[PDB]
Design a protein around this ligand. Structure first.
Ligand code: GTX
Ligand code: GTX
Lengths: 208, 208
C-alpha cells in the first residue's frame, strides 16, 4: 500500500496526506525523530539526503511534488486531458514557488522579514484568484471540473497562510469560497479535524 | 506551433530548447528586452508576473517545468509507464532544487558564496551518478531506455556547472560519459554549436 516517512510535522506532507484521506486511501506513517535523523544512517540512504520518503509497493519515491504527481497520476487527479494536465502543473509550480518563500521566511528570517512578506502576500495570492475566476466562475476546482493534486497542494498553502497572516483571504472572495468548499468535503473535513492533523506542528521550528 | 517568450538568455529555457531541437520541432522565439519588460504591460499580463511564457496553439503556459512536462507528455518523453513517469519526476525535481541554488549563487552572492558552493558540488551531483549507475550501468538515459524531458534538463544543469566549476564531472565517470553521449546526438550537437545557443549568455547578470 502507501507509506510516508517524514518528521513529526505537517510541512511538505500536509497536502499529500489530505489527498490520501479525501480519496479514501489507507497509508502508514513512519515518524522520523530529530535524534534518529542526526544518527546519519537514514539521511545517507535517502537519494537527496532528505525526507519525505514515500513507498508505493516496492516503488520508493522522494520529492514531495513527485509523490503528489504520482498519486495524481495513479488516482486520476491530473486533468481530463493533456491540456488540463499542463494547467494543473502550472498551478502546482506556482504553489511550489510561494511555498519556498514561505519556508524561507519561517526558517531564514521570520522576525525581520514577516512584515515585508505579508505586505507582498496579496500580489502572490492574486494569480490563484485570477485562475479561479476563469474556470466556471471559480465555483468548482482550480483546473477543470474534477479535483486534482494541485487543489490539495493549493488548499494547504492557503490554510497555512491564514495562520501566518489571518484575513489575507478576505480580499479574495473566490479563494475564500474555495477553501471553505473543499474543507467541507466529508473525508477531508473529518481529517482536518482529527488529532492526526491538528496536533502536528505546521513547520518544525515552532514558528507559523 | 510552438512559441517561447523569454529574455535574451539561456537560463530556464535552455533545456526546453534543446528538447525541441533534438526532437526536430519548429518553434518561434519572442525576445523580451529589459526595456520592454520594465515598461510593465507584459509583466502584468503574465500569470506569475514572469517569463518564460510558452504557446502551443491557443494553449498559453507559464513555468519552465510545466513547459518541459507538457512537451514531455505530448512528445512521448515521460517514461514508458507510470512507474517510470514517477522516476522521471523525481529526477527533474532534483534538477530543479540544484538549479535554484545555482540561480541563488549567480544572482544573490557569487563573490562570497562561490567557494562554499563548489566544495558542496560533489555531494549535490552524486545522486545523479547513483541514479545512472542503477539504470543499465548508466549506458542509456537517466530513467529507462528512452530519452525524457528530465534528460534535457539534467544535461543543461551539468553543462552550466562545467562552466562554473570546470572539472566537477571528472569525479563522476557515468555523468561525464552521459554528457558526451547526449551532446553527440546529431540534432542536439548541431543546436549546441549554433549561434542561436552559443551567442546567448547563460544567466543575465554577466556571471557564470
Ligand atoms: C526538525 C523539524 C523540521 C523539519 C522540516 C521539514 S524537513 C526539511 C528537509 N526536506 C526538504 O526540504 C524536502 C525538499 C524536497 N525538494 C521536497 O519537496 O520533498 C530535510 O529533510 N531536512 C533534513 C536535512 O536536510 O538534513
Ligand atoms: C535580465 C536578464 C536576466 C533574466 C533572468 C531570467 S528571468 C527571471 C524571472 N523568471 C523566473 O524566475 C521564472 C521562474 C518560474 N518558476 C519558472 O520556472 O519558469 C523573471 O521573469 N523575472 C522578471 C521579474 O520577476 O520581474
Amino acid at each position: 500500500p502507501y507509506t510516508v516517512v517524514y518528521f513529526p510535522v505537517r510541512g511538505r506532507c500536509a497536502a499529500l496526506r489530505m489527498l490520501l484521506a479525501d480519496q479514501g486511501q489507507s497509508w502508514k506513517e513512519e515518524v522520523v525523530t530529530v535524534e534518529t535523523w542526526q544518527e546519519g544512517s537514514l539521511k545517507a540512504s535517502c537519494l537527496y539526503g532528505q525526507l519525505p520518503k514515500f513507498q508505493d509497493g516496492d516503488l520508493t519515491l522522494y520529492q514531495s511534488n513527485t509523490i503528489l504527481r504520482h498519486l495524481g497520476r495513479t488516482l486520476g487527479l491530473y486533468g481530463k486531458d493533456q491540456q488540463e494536465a499542463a494547467l494543473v502543473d502550472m498551478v502546482n509550480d506556482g504553489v511550489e514557488d510561494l511555498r519556498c518563500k514561505y519556508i524561507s521566511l519561517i526558517f531564514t528570517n521570520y522576525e525581520a522579514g514577516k512584515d515585508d512578506y505579508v505586505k507582498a502576500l496579496p500580489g502572490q495570492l492574486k494569480p490563484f484568484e485570477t485562475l479561479l475566476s476563469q474556470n466556471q466562475g471559480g465555483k468548482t476546482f482550480i483546473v477543470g471540473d474534477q479535483i486534482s493534486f494541485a487543489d490539495y497542494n493549493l488548499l494547504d498553502l492557503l490554510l497555512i497562510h491564514e495562520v501566518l497572516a489571518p484575513g489575507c483571504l478576505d480580499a479574495f472572495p473566490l479563494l475564500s469560497a474555495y477553501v471553505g468548499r473543499l474543507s467541507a468535503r466529508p473525508k477531508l473535513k473529518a481529517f482536518l479535524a482529527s488529532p492526526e492533523y491538528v496536533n502536528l506542528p505546521i513547520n518544525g521550528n515552532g514558528k507559523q
